[PDB]
Amino acid sequence: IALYIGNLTWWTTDEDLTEAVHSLGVNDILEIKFFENRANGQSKGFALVGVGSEASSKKLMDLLPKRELHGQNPVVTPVNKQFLSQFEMQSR
């Protein structure tokens, strides 16, 4: 079970993100992996998240995007090669 989170600052961190979901109250995070410029390791502004529950996935899908991380709305979509492209189009 996995997702895509995006539209967050390049200083939005795995740690202080987990706090966000912990606020919705999930705690399911298995692992998170940010996408970033290899050139300088700078975050692109979106991460592939890993989760273990399905009901929470709903909550994330459902509710997260109506919250502010650093002034941003977590554009959460599921893992798909056609979503991804918009997330990097974002970079540009």
Binding site: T9, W11, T13, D14, E15, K33, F34, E36, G41, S43
Partner: protein
């Protein structure tokens, strides 16, 4: 008139360092030292595992400088035909950074017969944000738990000394212009040493 003695400077402001000819240093062999990991994917797996029991990897490397033709050369270990590393390795948990490099250097170049290393300069820090090759001289904003941290120490040599080398490794003296803007050749770290050493004031004995 009589010469005035330019006093020593604050070390932070001027670091003078002594370099001796490659000749002053003699190098014999020793039973070969195959690395702990093996394949590329092999060592990352090990990393993942370990990070969970111990945590972030602590690596230390020593930059031994000699010179030739009034031009500093860094001793680089070399496996096979195109891989170089700095003498150094993984610290055991809790280990004092320096004590650990000493243990490692001795492990990796020790003379059969109790030598001593002079390490009192950290010359660089490199971090691996995730579990892949990417390393940067800094910790990115988003990263809160780096997978591996590498600390670099200039290692001063004495006027002369003898070293031993694993029968598998070859030992080369890379001159700086051989390394500079040569990331493809030696990687980022090694290839930026000319920069990271430029700050030192070298003496060619």
């Amino acid at each position: 008139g009589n010469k005035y003695i330019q006093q020593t400077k604050p070390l932070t402001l001027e670091r003078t360092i002594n370099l001796y000819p490659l000749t002053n240093y003699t190098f014999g062999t020793k039973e070969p030292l195959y690395e702990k990991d093996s394949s590329v994917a092999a060592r990352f797996q090990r990393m993942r595992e370990e990070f969970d029991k111990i945590g972030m990897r602590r690596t230390v490397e020593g930059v031994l400088i000699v010179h030739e033709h009034r031009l500093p050369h860094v001793l680089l270990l070399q496996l096979g035909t195109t891989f170089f590393k700095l003498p150094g390795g993984e610290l055991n948990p809790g280990e004092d950074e320096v004590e650990g490099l000493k243990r490692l250097m001795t492990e990796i170049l020790g003379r059969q017969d109790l030598q001593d290393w002079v390490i009192d300069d950290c010359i660089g820090n490199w971090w691996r944000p995730n579990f892949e090759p990417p390393q940067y001289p800094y910790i990115p904003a988003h990263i809160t738990k780096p997978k591996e941290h590498k600390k670099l120490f200039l290692v001063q040599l004495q006027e002369k000394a003898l070293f031993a080398v694993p029968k598998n490794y070859k030992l080369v003296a890379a001159p700086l212009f051989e390394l500079y803007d040569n990331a493809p050749g030696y990687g980022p770290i090694i290839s930026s040493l000319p920069q990271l050493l430029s700050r030192f004031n070298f003496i060619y004995n």
